[PDB]
Design a protein around this ligand. Sequence first.
Ligand SMILES: *[C@@H]1O[C@H](CO)[C@@H](O[C@@H]2O[C@H](CO)[C@@H](O)[C@H](O[C@@H]3O[C@H](CO[C@H]4O[C@H](CO)[C@@H](O)[C@H](O[C@H]5O[C@H](CO)[C@@H](O)[C@H](O)[C@@H]5O[C@H]5O[C@H](CO)[C@@H](O)[C@H](O)[C@@H]5O)[C@@H]4O)[C@@H](O)[C@H](O[C@H]4O[C@H](CO)[C@@H](O)[C@H](O)[C@@H]4O[C@H]4O[C@H](CO)[C@@H](O)[C@H](O)[C@@H]4O)[C@@H]3O)[C@H]2NC(C)=O)[C@H](O)[C@H]1NC(C)=O
Ligand SMILES: *[C@@H]1O[C@H](CO)[C@@H](O[C@@H]2O[C@H](CO)[C@@H](O)[C@H](O[C@@H]3O[C@H](CO)[C@@H](O)[C@H](O[C@H]4O[C@H](CO)[C@@H](O)[C@H](O)[C@@H]4O)[C@@H]3O)[C@H]2NC(C)=O)[C@H](O)[C@H]1NC(C)=O
Ligand code: CA
Ligand code: CL
Length: 126
Amino acid sequence: CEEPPTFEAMELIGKPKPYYEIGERVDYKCKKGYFYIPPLATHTICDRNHTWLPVSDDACYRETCPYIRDPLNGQAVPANGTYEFGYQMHFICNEGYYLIGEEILYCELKGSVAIWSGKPPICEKV
Ligand SMILES: *[C@@H]1O[C@H](CO)[C@@H](O[C@@H]2O[C@H](CO)[C@@H](O)[C@H](O[C@@H]3O[C@H](CO[C@H]4O[C@H](CO)[C@@H](O)[C@H](O[C@H]5O[C@H](CO)[C@@H](O)[C@H](O)[C@@H]5O[C@H]5O[C@H](CO)[C@@H](O)[C@H](O)[C@@H]5O)[C@@H]4O)[C@@H](O)[C@H](O[C@H]4O[C@H](CO)[C@@H](O)[C@H](O)[C@@H]4O[C@H]4O[C@H](CO)[C@@H](O)[C@H](O)[C@@H]4O)[C@@H]3O)[C@H]2NC(C)=O)[C@H](O)[C@H]1NC(C)=O
Ligand SMILES: *[C@@H]1O[C@H](CO)[C@@H](O[C@@H]2O[C@H](CO)[C@@H](O)[C@H](O[C@@H]3O[C@H](CO)[C@@H](O)[C@H](O[C@H]4O[C@H](CO)[C@@H](O)[C@H](O)[C@@H]4O)[C@@H]3O)[C@H]2NC(C)=O)[C@H](O)[C@H]1NC(C)=O
Ligand SMILES: [Ca+2]
Ligand SMILES: [Cl-]
């Protein structure tokens, strides 16, 4: 096999070789800001078809901004589904009930932690 994949959350351990013999195993690590969360794989092997076995960065977790209790009568559903930084929180209200706050709270880099965008919505009545 050639050089193992590159990921946005994982960094290969040891320096890249040009060629890897079949049955050779490479191991990765979470990049400076990440945290690994069991169980998922973070390594790979060079199979008999001289390709690497599938593997994902999707286990190395980037910090997270706190938790948001579903505003009574609307669920606090994430799109870009995750409470990690760099994404958003939206307050879709119930077919009818509209908002006293704002539809989307974006979670992102603040200092070292990551906090969402401002303060969350109230789901009132009509
Ligand atoms: C062991 O090692 C090998 C070594 O790499 C691995 O290789 C794979 O094997 C083949 C053979 O080399 C490669 O084709 C593949 O890389 C490309 O594959 C493309 C995917 O094919 C799709 O397009 C088809 C064309 O319409 C489409 O029908 C098809 O959908 C079906 O096929 C997929 C995969 O075959 C299948 O999973 C799916 O279920 C579908 O089912 C098909 O099969 C049925 C039975 O036959 C049939 O009934 C269905 O109708 C259906 O066909 C795929 O989605 C190839 O399309 C691509 O070929 C190029 O050439 C043509 C002709 O000139 C161009 O039109 C076309 O645009 C392609 O060129 C572009 O793409 C290349 C590559 O990105 C790019 O460089 C060019 O610039 C250009 O844009 C390639 O051959 C390899 N996959 C991988 C992951 O490497 C094996 O995986 C491995 N085995 C194992 C177990 O791991
Ligand atoms: C996080 O999830 C969000 C969903 O809740 C998402 O935010 C939205 O992104 C969607 C696109 O990914 C969009 O629905 C929305 O904006 C647009 O929707 C149009 C469809 O009606 C698209 O057409 C449009 O762009 C594309 O289409 C035109 C052709 O019609 C092309 O010309 C153009 O080049 C382009 O290809 C666009 O997608 C947007 N809404 C909000 C609040 O952002 C968000 O993207 C997800 N974030 C991540 C990081 O994935
Ligand atoms: Ca990812
Ligand atoms: Cl592992």
